[PDB]
C-alpha cells in the first residue's frame, strides 16, 4: 500500500479534457438560466407593484389585489410542483445532496421546467424564499442534462457535472464564485465516503456562470454596506458570545422548520388542491405584507443594507425578526419552490444588528459599530442551522467585502457551529435528506 | 440506504476532547510561529547591525555580510543533517505523508531542529519562506499533544496533525482562511477518505491567528492598498497570463527537482561537504542582500514596490531570473525553509511584467499593471504546487482586493489547466513521491 500511493501521487489532479470542457458548458447554461430566473422574478415583482399603482385609491381594494396577485402566482407555483415534479418543492439542495450520494433521481426533464416556472411564481409573488434553492437545484439538473445528452460514462463525470452544476448555481445566485466552490467541498460532497468530484472542474463551471451573471448584472451589487470599522482584539469575545447565542438558536430554528412541515402537512394531508389553496393563502399574505410592512416579506436582501447602517430602532428589529421567522417558516416549510438560504442571512443580520446595539450602549469604550456585529451574525444562521460555516463566512465576505472583519466573522461563525452541535442540532439540508430518504423506506 | 440515514443524523459530531485539544494546538503553534518570526527578524537586524560598524572599507563589509550569512546557514544545515534529516527543505511534503500514515512525526527531533535551524537559514537572509518551518513545526506541535495526552484513534491523529499545520500556515501569513483552505485542498489524503474534522481545524487556526495578532497587530505583511477594478473585456488578458504561468509552472518544478539532484552531487550525502556548501549559498544571499536585496531574502519586501509599478521593465526581468536562481539554490539545497513565499514574490514580478506589457499594448483598457501583479501573485502556487484555491484565498487575504476576484481566479485556473496539459505535477506531492520511493529503493 506504499507502492500504490507513489503511483497515485504522480497521477493526482488528472481530470480528463472531456470532463473539463463539459464543466465549462454546464456553468455557461446554469448562469444564463440563473440570470433568466433572476430577471423573470424581478419583472413579476414589478408587474405586481404596477397594479398597486392602478388601484392606489380605495385602500381595501389595493390590499385585495396585492393578495390576489400573490395568491394566484403562488397557486400557479405550488401546482406546477405538485402535478409535474414533487421533488422540486422546498429547497432542492437536500435533493441534489442525495443525488450525489446516488440515492436520488435527477429528473431534469421534470425539475427544470417545474423549478424555473414554479419558483418564478412563488418568488415573484414576494414570498420569503431565496433564489439559491431554485438556482442550485436547476444548476445540478442542468449539469445532469448534459451528462445525459452527451452520454458521458463513469463515476467521475456523473458526480462532477452534478456538483459544478449546483456550484455554478449558487455562484450566480449571489454573484459569489468562491462561495459556490466552497459550498461543494464542505456541504454537497458525500461526507462519509470518498467522491470523484473534480475540484478543478467545479471551478470552470463556477467561473462561467459568474461571468454569465456579470454580463447582465454588472456594476450593481446585491448588498452594498461599504467599508465598515475594524474590530480591535479586546472586542472579539463579544463575537464569541454572539456565536453562542446563534449556536443555541440554530437547532431551535431547525426543529421549527422541520416541525412546521409536519404541522402544514395536516392542513392539506397530501391532497393537491388543499395544498395549492393553502399556497395561495401564504403567497397572498406575503404580497399583502410586502405593502403593509415589506421588511417582513420578500427575499430579504433589501433590509440588510438598511439594518447594518443601524437605521432601524431596537423595537423595529425585534418586530422584523419575529415576523420574518414566522414568514420564513410558512413559505419554506410549506414546501413552496425556493431556498431558505437567503432568508437565513436576513434573519442573521437582524439578530446581529440587535446584538450590536445592545453592545454599543453597554460598552461605549469599545467604540462599537452595530453594523460590524450584523455582518458577523449575517452568515451565523447558516453556520448553525445549515452547519456550513466556511461556506457562510466566505459567502458574507463576498457580498459585504469587509475582510477587516474576518476574525469576528469566523469566531461568531464557529461559536454558532459548536453550540449548534452540543445542543443536538443537525445539518438542516442533511436532515431533510434523511427525512425524505426514510419516508421512502417507510411506505413499502 | 439505512446506513446513510444513520450517518446524516450523526454528521459533524467531533468529540469535545478533540476540539479542546485543537484549541491548545493552535495556541502553541501560533506562539511558536510568533517566536520563530521574531527570531528571524532579530538576526536580520544583527546582521544589518554589523554592516553599520564596518560601513567604511567596501570589501570588508561585503565579506562580513557573507561570513555572517555563511555561519548562520552553516549552523542551520548542520542542525538538520545531524539531528533531523526529515526537517530539511520545506517539510510540507513530509506532513502530507504523515497524514497518509507513511511518515514518522518525530516532533522531539524536528521542533528544535526546524525552529533553530530555520532561524539560521531565514535570518541569514536566504530565499526561503516562513511557511515551511511554521507548517512543519505546526503539525509536529499538534502531534506532540497527541502523544503527551495519549489521544487514541484515527480521528484524533489526523485532526491534531492537520490543524497543527493549518494553524501553522495561518500564523505564517496572518491568513486564517488560507490555512483552513490549504488543509482541505492539498494536505488531505487526496485518494481516500480521511477523519480530518474541519470544525477542529478552525479552532486551531482561530487560536494561532489571534496569537499572531497579539504580537503583530496594526502592521500588515503586504500593503498594496485598494487597486482599480477589472472590466469584463479585460478578463481574457488574465487567462493569457494564466496560460503563461501554466507552461512555466511545471518548468520550475523540473528545475527545483533537478537542482536537488545536481546539488546532491556536490556533497554526495556527506555532512561536511553539505554544511560548507550551505554557508556558501547562505553567504551569497547575505552578500546579495546588500548589492541588490531584491534578488535575496523572503521577497515580501518587493511585492508592494513591484505592484505599484515602481520597477522598470529591465529591473523586473533581472529581479525575476535572479530570484529564479536564488530560489532554486536555497530550497533545492534542502535548507530549512519554505518555497511557498518565494513563489508569491516570483509571481508578482511576472504579473507586473505582464501588466506593463499590457499597459502600452492596450491603452484603451485603462490598465493598472498592479492588477496583473495580483492576479499573477498566487499563480505560481496554482501551477507549481497546484493548490489554486489556497493560492487565490491566500493572496486575497494579504492584498484585500476582492474586486479583483475574477481575474485572480481566471489567472489561477489558467495556471492549473496548462500546468496539467504539459505533464506537470503537484510539487509538494512530487517530493513526497520522491522521498517515499527512495525509501523502497
Amino acid at each position, epitope marked *: 500500500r506504499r507502492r500504490q500511493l507513489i503511483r497515485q501521487l504522480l497521477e493526482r489532479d488528472k481530470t480528463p479534457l472531456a470532463i473539463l470542457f463539459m464543466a465549462a458548458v454546464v456553468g455557461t447554461l446554469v448562469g444564463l438560466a440563473a440570470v433568466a430566473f433572476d430577471k423573470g422574478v424581478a419583472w413579476l415583482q414589478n408587474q405586481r407593484m404596477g397594479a398597486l399603482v392602478h388601484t392606489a385609491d380605495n385602500y381595501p381594494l389595493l390590499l385585495t389585489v396585492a393578495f390576489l396577485c400573490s395568491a394566484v402566482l403562488a397557486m400557479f407555483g405550488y401546482f406546477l410542483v405538485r402535478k409535474y415534479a414533487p421533488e422540486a418543492g422546498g429547497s432542492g439542495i437536500p435533493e441534489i445532496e442525495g443525488a450525489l450520494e446516488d440515492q436520488r433521481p435527477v429528473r431534469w426533464w421534470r425539475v427544470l421546467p417545474v423549478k424555473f416556472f414554479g419558483g418564478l411564481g412563488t418568488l415573484g409573488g414576494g414570498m420569503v424564499l431565496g433564489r439559491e434553492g431554485p438556482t442550485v437545484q436547476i444548476g445540478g439538473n442542468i449539469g445532469r442534462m448534459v451528462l445525459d445528452i452527451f452520454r458521458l460514462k463513469g463515476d467521475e463525470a456523473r458526480h462532477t457535472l452534478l456538483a459544478t452544476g449546483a456550484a455554478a448555481g449558487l455562484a450566480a445566485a449571489f454573484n459569489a464564485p468562491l462561495a459556490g466552490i466552497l459550498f461543494i467541498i464542505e456541504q454537497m460532497r458525500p461526507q462519509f465516503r470518498y467522491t470523484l468530484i473534480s475540484i478543478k472542474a467545479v471551478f470552470i463551471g463556477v467561473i462561467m456562470s459568474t461571468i454569465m451573471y456579470r*454580463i447582465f448584472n*454588472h456594476e450593481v451589487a446585491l448588498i452594498d454596506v461599504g467599508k465598515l470599522s475594524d474590530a480591535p482584539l479586546n472586542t472579539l469575545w463579544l463575537y464569541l458570545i454572539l456565536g453562542i447565542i446563534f449556536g443555541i438558536f440554530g437547532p431551535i430554528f431547525n426543529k421549527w422548520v422541520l416541525g412546521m412541515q409536519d404541522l402544514l402537512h395536516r392542513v392539506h394531508g397530501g391532497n393537491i388542491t388543499k395544498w395549492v389553496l393553502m399556497g395561495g393563502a401564504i403567497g397572498g399574505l406575503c404580497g399583502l405584507l410586502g405593502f403593509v410592512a415589506p421588511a417582513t416579506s420578500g427575499g430579504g436582501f433589501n433590509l440588510i443594507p438598511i439594518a447594518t447602517a443601524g437605521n432601524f430602532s431596537m423595537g423595529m428589529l425585534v418586530f422584523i425578526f419575529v415576523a420574518r421567522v414566522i414568514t420564513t417558516l410558512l413559505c419554506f416549510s410549506s414546501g413552496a419552490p425556493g431556498g431558505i438560504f437567503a432568508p437565513m442571512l436576513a434573519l442573521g443580520t437582524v439578530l446581529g444588528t440587535a446584538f450590536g446595539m445592545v453592545a454599543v450602549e453597554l460598552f461605549p469604550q469599545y467604540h462599537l459599530e452595530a453594523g460590524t456585529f450584523a455582518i458577523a451574525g449575517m452568515g451565523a444562521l447558516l453556520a448553525a442551522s445549515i452547519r456550513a460555516p466556511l461556506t457562510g463566512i466566505i459567502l458574507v465576505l463576498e457580498m459585504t467585502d469587509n475582510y477587516q472583519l474576518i476574525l469576528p466573522m469566523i469566531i461568531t461563525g464557529l461559536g454558532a457551529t459548536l453550540l449548534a452541535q452540543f445542543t443536538g442540532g443537525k445539518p438542516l439540508y442533511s436532515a431533510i435528506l434523511a427525512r425524505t430518504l426514510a419516508k421512502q423506506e417507510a411506505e413499502q | 440506504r439505512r446506513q446513510l440515514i444513520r450517518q446524516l443524523l450523526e454528521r459533524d459530531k467531533t468529540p469535545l476532547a478533540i476540539l479542546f485539544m485543537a484549541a491548545v494546538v493552535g495556541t502553541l503553534v501560533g506562539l511558536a510561529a510568533v517566536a520563530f518570526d521574531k527570531g528571524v527578524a532579530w538576526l536580520q537586524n544583527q546582521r544589518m547591525g554589523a554592516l553599520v560598524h564596518t560601513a567604511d572599507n567596501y570589501p570588508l563589509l561585503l565579506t562580513v555580510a557573507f561570513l555572517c550569512s555563511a555561519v548562520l546557514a552553516m549552523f542551520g544545515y548542520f542542525l538538520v543533517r545531524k539531528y533531523a534529516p526529515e526537517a530539511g527543505g520545506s517539510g510540507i511534503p513530509e506532513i502530507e505523508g504523515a497524514l497518509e500514515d507513511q511518515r514518522p512525526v518525530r516532533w522531539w527531533r524536528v521542533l528544535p531542529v526546524k525552529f533553530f535551524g530555520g532561524l539560521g537559514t531565514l535570518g541569514g537572509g536566504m530565499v526561503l519562506g516562513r511557511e515551511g518551518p511554521t507548517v512543519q513545526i505546526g503539525g509536529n506541535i499538534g502531534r506532540m499533544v497527541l502523544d503527551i495526552f495519549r489521544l487514541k484513534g484515527d480521528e484524533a491523529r489526523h485532526t491534531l496533525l492537520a490543524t497543527g499545520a493549518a494553524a501553522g500556515l495561518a500564523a505564517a501569513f496572518n491568513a486564517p482562511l488560507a490555512g483552513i483552505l490549504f488543509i482541505i485542498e492539498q494536505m488531505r489524503p487526496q485518494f481516500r477518505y480521511t477523519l480530518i474534522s474541519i470544525k477542529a481545524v478552525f479552532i486551531g487556526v482561530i487560536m494561532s491567528t489571534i496569537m499572531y495578532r497579539i504580537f503583530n497587530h496594526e502592521v500588515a505583511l503586504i500593503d498594496v492598498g485598494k487597486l*482599480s477594478d477589472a*472590466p*469584463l*473585456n*479585460t478578463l481574457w488578458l488574465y487567462l493569457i497570463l494564466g496560460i503563461i504561468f501554466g507552461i512555466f509552472g511545471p518548468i520550475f518544478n523540473k528545475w527545483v527537482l533537478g537542482m536537488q539532484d545536481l546539488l546532491h552531487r556536490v556533497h554526495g550525502g556527506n555532512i561536511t561537504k553539505w554544511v560548507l556548501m550551505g554557508g556558501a549559498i547562505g553567504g551569497l544571499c547575505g552578500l546579495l542582500g546588500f548589492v541588490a536585496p531584491a534578488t535575496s531574502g523572503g521577497g515580501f519586501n518587493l511585492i508592494p514596490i513591484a505592484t505599484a*509599478g515602481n520597477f522598470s521593465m529591465g529591473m523586473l526581468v533581472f529581479i525575476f531570473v535572479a530570484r529564479v536562481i536564488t530560489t532554486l539554490l536555497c530550497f533545492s539545497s534542502g535548507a530549512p525553509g519554505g518555497i511557498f513565499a518565494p513563489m508569491l514574490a516570483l509571481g508578482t514580478v511576472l504579473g507586473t511584467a505582464f501588466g506593463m506589457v499590457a*499597459v502600452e499594448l492596450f*491603452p*484603451q*483598457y*485603462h490598465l*493598472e499593471a498592479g492588477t496583473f501583479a495580483i492576479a499573477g501573485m498566487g499563480a505560481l502556487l496554482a501551477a507549481s504546487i497546484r493548490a489554486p484555491l489556497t493560492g487565490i484565498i491566500l493572496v486575497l487575504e494579504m492584498t484585500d482586493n476582492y474586486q479583483l476576484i475574477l481575474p485572480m481566479i481566471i489567472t489561477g485556473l489558467g495556471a492549473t489547466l496548462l500546468a496539467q496539459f504539459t505533464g506537470g505535477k503537484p510539487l509538494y506531492s512530487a517530493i513526497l513521491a520522491r522521498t517515499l520511493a527512495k525509501q523502497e529503493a
Partner: antibody
Amino acid sequence: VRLLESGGGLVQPGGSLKLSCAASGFDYSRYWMSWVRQAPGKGLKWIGEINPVSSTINYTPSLKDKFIISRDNAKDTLYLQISKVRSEDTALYYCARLYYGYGYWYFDVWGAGTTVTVSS
Amino acid sequence: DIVLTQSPAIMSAAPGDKVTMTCSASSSVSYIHWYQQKSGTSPKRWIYDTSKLTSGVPVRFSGSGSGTSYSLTINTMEAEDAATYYCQQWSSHPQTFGGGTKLEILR
C-alpha cells in the same frame, strides 16, 4: 456629483493659461478624469486623460507641452495647462469623469465648462 | 485615429415620427456611446455600449449596430428631444467623436 471647472477666459496669442476643475459628491480617486473641448458652433474633441494616481497620462496628437494635465487628489481638483495658445484653442473646456460599461470607456459626468477666447 | 461621421447633418421631424440617425465609422468599432446636448447645456451621457440606456432616459430611445454603422433611434419622437446628438467610441484609441445630428422639431 458635480464638476465645476473654471480658470479660463482672456489670454494673448502664443501665451499660456491654467484651467482648474473642482469636484465634490464622489470619491475623487477611483476615477480617471478627462478633458474635452468644443469650439464655438462645432463638434467635440478629446484633449487628455489622467489616472487616479497621476501615473499614466496620455494626450491627443499635440506636441511638447501644448497641453499639460495634472491633478491634486487632496484638493479634489483637476488642472489643464495650455501652452502656446493659437486661435483654434478658442473653445469651451469640459472636465469629464471617465467610466466604463462592459469595458469600453465613456465620459460619464460632464462639467458645465469654461470659455477660452484667444484675442488681444 | 477612427474618423466617425453622423448620418443626417440636421434632421427635422414631427413628434410621433419614428426617427433614426446613424454613426458611421472609418474603420471597425464596437460598443459605441451616444451623447445628448440640448441647446446651451453640457452633453449628457445618453446611450452607451451600443444599446444600453443611461439611468433616466425616456424608454423611447434605443441603440443598435456593429462594425461600420451604428445608429440611435427615437421610437415615437417627442419635442423635448430637440438636441444635437453626438456619437463617440473607445474600442480603439484615441477615442473620437462624431459630427452631430442636430434634431429639429416640426409643429
